[PDB]
Amino acid sequence: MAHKKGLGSTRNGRDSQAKRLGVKRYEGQVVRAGNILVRQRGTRFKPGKNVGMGRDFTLFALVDGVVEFQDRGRLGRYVHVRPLA
Amino acid sequence: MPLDVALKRKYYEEVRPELIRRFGYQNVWEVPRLEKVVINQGLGEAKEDARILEKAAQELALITGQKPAVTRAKKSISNFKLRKGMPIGLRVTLRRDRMWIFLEKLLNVALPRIRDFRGLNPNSFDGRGNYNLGLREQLIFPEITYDMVDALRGMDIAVVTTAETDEEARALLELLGFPFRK
Amino acid sequence: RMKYRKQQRGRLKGATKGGDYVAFGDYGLVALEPAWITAQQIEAARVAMVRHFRRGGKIFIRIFPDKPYTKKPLEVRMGKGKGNVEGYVAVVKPGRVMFEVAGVTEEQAMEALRIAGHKLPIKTKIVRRDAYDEAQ
Amino acid sequence: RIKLLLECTECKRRNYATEKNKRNTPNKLELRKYCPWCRKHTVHREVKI
RNA sequence: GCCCGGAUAGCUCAGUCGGUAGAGCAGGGGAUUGAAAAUCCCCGUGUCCUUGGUUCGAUUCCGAGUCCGGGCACC
RNA sequence: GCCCGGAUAGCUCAGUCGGUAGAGCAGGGGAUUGAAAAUCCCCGUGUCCUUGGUUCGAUUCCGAGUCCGGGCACCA
RNA sequence: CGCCUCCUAAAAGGUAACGGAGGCGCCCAAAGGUCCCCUCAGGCGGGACGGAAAUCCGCCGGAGAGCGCAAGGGUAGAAGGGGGCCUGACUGCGAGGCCUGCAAGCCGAGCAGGGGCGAAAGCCGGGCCUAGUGAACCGGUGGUCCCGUGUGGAAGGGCCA
Numbered sequence: 001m002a003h004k005k006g007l008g009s010t011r012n013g014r015d016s017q018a019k020r021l022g023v024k025r026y027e028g029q030v031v032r033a034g035n036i037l038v039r040q041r042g043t044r045f046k047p048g049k050n051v052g053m054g055r056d057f058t059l060f061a062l063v064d065g066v067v068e069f070q071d072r073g074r075l076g077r078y079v080h081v082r083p084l085a
Numbered sequence: 086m087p088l089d090v091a092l093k094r095k096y097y098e099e100v101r102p103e104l105i106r107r108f109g110y111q112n113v114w115e116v117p118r119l120e121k122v123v124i125n126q127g128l129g130e131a132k133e134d135a136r137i138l139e140k141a142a143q144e145l146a147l148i149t150g151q152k153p154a155v156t157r158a159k160k161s162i163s164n165f166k167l168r169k170g171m172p173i174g175l176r177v178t179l180r181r182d183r184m185w186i187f188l189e190k191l192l193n194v195a196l197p198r199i200r201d202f203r204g205l206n207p208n209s210f211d212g213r214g215n216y217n218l219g220l221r222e223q224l225i226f227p228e229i230t231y232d233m234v235d236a237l238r239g240m241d242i243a244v245v246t247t248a249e250t251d252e253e254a255r256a257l258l259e260l261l262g263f264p265f266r267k
Numbered sequence: 268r269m270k271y272r273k274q275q276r277g278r279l280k281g282a283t284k285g286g287d288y289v290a291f292g293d294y295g296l297v298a299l300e301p302a303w304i305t306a307q308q309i310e311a312a313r314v315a316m317v318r319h320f321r322r323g324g325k326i327f328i329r330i331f332p333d334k335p336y337t338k339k340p341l342e343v344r345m346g347k348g349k350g351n352v353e354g355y356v357a358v359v360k361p362g363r364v365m366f367e368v369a370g371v372t373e374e375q376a377m378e379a380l381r382i383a384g385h386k387l388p389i390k391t392k393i394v395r396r397d398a399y400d401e402a403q
Numbered sequence: 404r405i406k407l408l409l410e411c412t413e414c415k416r417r418n419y420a421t422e423k424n425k426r427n428t429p430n431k432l433e434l435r436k437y438c439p440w441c442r443k444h445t446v447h448r449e450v451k452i
Numbered sequence: 453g454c455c456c457g458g459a460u461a462g463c464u465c466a467g468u469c470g471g472u473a474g475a476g477c478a479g480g481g482g483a484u485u486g487a488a489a490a491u492c493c494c495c496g497u498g499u500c501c502u503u504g505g506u507u508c509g510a511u512u513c514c515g516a517g518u519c520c521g522g523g524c525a526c527c
Numbered sequence: 528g529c530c531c532g533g534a535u536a537g538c539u540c541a542g543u544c545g546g547u548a549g550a551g552c553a554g555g556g557g558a559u560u561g562a563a564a565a566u567c568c569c570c571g572u573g574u575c576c577u578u579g580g581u582u583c584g585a586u587u588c589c590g591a592g593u594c595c596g597g598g599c600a601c602c603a
Numbered sequence: 604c605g606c607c608u609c610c611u612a613a614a615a616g617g618u619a620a621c622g623g624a625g626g627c628g629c630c631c632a633a634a635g636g637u638c639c640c641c642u643c644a645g646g647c648g649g650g651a652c653g654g655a656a657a658u659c660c661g662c663c664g665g666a667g668a669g670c671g672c673a674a675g676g677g678u679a680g681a682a683g684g685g686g687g688c689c690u691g692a693c694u695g696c697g698a699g700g701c702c703u704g705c706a707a708g709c710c711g712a713g714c715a716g717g718g719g720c721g722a723a724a725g726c727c728g729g730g731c732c733u734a735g736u737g738a739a740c741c742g743g744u745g746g747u748c749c750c751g752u753g754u755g756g757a758a759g760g761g762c763c764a
């Protein structure tokens with residue numbers, strides 16, 4: 001008396017908003033304070049000279065510097081801002 | 086009292102060079118002397134809090150300077166694997182001389198003293214020649230009388246020695262404070 | 268089969284090549300053109316062999332009951348959480364080092380395999396130890 | 404309503420500053436500190452329900 | 453495709469909110485009977501499911517889990 | 528969110544218009560006890576929720592605080 | 604049927620699916636500041652009331668114990684464990700950037716008033732961080748002391764909190 005399918009909605013209600021962060025400011029490019037560079041939800045980044053780590057593990061330009069990519073090899077990743085020009 | 090003080094002083098001072106070169110021939114170093122002595126006893130869970138905690142007091146006290154308050158069962162022994170922080174650190178880490186009139190009074194003057202208190206213990210320290218042996222019953226009246234029926238018993242102390250390897254350490258407190266049988 | 272005390276529910280699907288080769292006794296069954304193979308079928312061979320071999324002196328192993336295959340429903344219409352666990356098996360694809368001993372000493376072992384796999388489920392080949400292998 | 408209720412700071416009749424706060428542990432106990440725009444900084448006090 | 457151990461004495465179920473556990477039935481020992489019932493006196497019983505955590509203290513308050521339950525499984 | 532009531536013995540509750548704290552039940556103790564009772568006498572404990580002021584003093588009087596109980600009204 | 608975390612986004616970033624998984628719609632009055640100290644679990648060997656597992660001694664160790672809460676990142680060159688003193692979990696504010704079409708949400712040197720931790724070289728405009736969140740209307744209260752429908756006031760009302 002009525003063979004038509006059957007209920008079946010087990011459920012995987014999963015979700016994660018999109019995001020940002022990362023290696024976000026190109027070699028050498030003109031990098032001014034206020035200008036953010038590389039955000040890290042960790043510590044792949046050590047705020048070297050003029051590199052200001054914001055109250056969030058966010059690499060922000062502390063000075064008018066040329067984009068200073070300072071991978072200090074093994075010490076870890078070290079970010080730096082070079083004395084303008 | 087200060088009697089046995091001068092005593093340990095000498096026992097060791099001389100015995101030291103004694104065996105020191107008797108076998109050493111290093112440079113009369115901690116080959117093999119003894120330094121500082123911590124003492125530990127029957128953990129707070131042995132508690133009643135106010136009562137036997139204060140008794141732990143009396144005892145730690147007249148014994149070597151330090152005597153218990155009221156807190157001995159937190160994060161509780163509870164049921165088997167039931168325990169949290171560790172607010173029951175009741176011990177004396179006193180460091181030197183006091184310690185020696187102690188090697189004295191203690192080992193050499195209270196050693197055998199109560200119920201078959203013989204001492205026929207194998208490899209006393211042996212865990213690197215530094216201590217081992219704590220006794221499982223107080224020096225009864227190392228002072229005080231009935232100031233608690235069960236009062237205390239789980240007693241065990243430890244010395245910080247340099248009597249490096251055993252045989253050596255053995256020479257050390259063996260003749261210095263008595264090596265309990267085989 | 269055996270893929271006991273797993274950890275997750277299901278895998279996914281692909282295939283292409285891997286890392287099976289060696290030897291391990293000199294009575295070898297190597298796949299060639301497969302993919303996953305029923306842990307069962309597997310046991311099948313296991314049997315086949317075991318039995319043939321005067322029924323005693325042990326064979327060895329090879330792959331494992333590896334993944335969880337799901338036909339999900341039972342035959343419904345499709346949209347389940349794709350749930351349902353159901354058939355568990357091997358994931359071997361480039362002629363793989365499938366290793367089986369016993370002490371047959373011969374084309375007897377041969378037969379054993381012959382059927383075991385002839386059976387099993389693919390274009391495959393068999394042999395022995397042909398170019399040793401040096402490790403650290 | 405939970406052991407989390409909102410209060411705010413006011414200062415010796417010469418201002419009031421805000422901020423929420425709680426209820427739990429030491430409950431009422433509510434002096435605190437803070438600084439109003441009164442004078443240049445100044446105690447304040449806090450309390451205020 | 454849910455509702456609460458929906459727990460705690462041998463059982464059926466109270467009680468707590470963390471201090472208190474209880475009752476009925478069962479049961480053990482005497483009494484009545486010629487002997488059993490019934491009836492009459494006396495009595496003992498609890499990891500309060502396991503579990504970590506908090507707290508000075510947890511059966512009780514949180515966190516995880518096991519079991520037994522309850523709403524659909526069918527248009 | 529206002530508007531009323533209470534806070535007392537272990538339980539439920541009396542209580543000068545400021546001078547004492549009292550019932551009822553539970554709990555315990557003896558006589559009675561085929562017997563269960565009912566009877567029958569006897570007790571047990573109180574910052575009278577807390578903090579101050581009124582008064583020679585205050586369970587009481589007033590303010591304030593916490594709590595529980597009632598009620599009544601809204602809620603973008 | 605809102606948000607955080609991991610996979611698939613396939614290597615920039617970034618994307619469905621009735622695709623996998625799994626948490627939050629608390630608080631922490633001091634896990635909020637800074638100054639001074641310290642420094643894991645676990646392995647082994649030796650020990651009172653032990654007695655698989657406390658407490659103490661003796662070694663060993665890319666740190667896998669740890670950080671309210673889930674994941675992931677980080678990370679004891681401690682954000683982690685302990686002591687002292689204290690409120691900036693400040694108002695005025697910010698240049699200049701993350702992402703985003705909207706609004707959002709988010710990162711922040713430095714100038715001012717004003718303090719607090721050291722003597723100070725300086726850190727502090729909440730926490731170790733990524734979830735604990737809600738326009739607009741409407742109306743309340745603590746201001747303010749701007750407006751008032753002739754003028755004085757006021758019902759009432761504008762901006763602040």
Ligand SMILES: *[PH](O)(O)OC[C@H]1O[C@@H](n2cnc3c(N)ncnc32)[C@H](O)[C@@H]1N
Pocket residue numbers: 001002003004005527
């Ligand atoms: P009935 O007793 O016929 O059993 C199910 C029948 O109903 C139809 N059906 C069930 N569920 C449906 C949804 N969600 N959409 C459309 N039709 C649906 C089936 O055809 C089945 N025969």
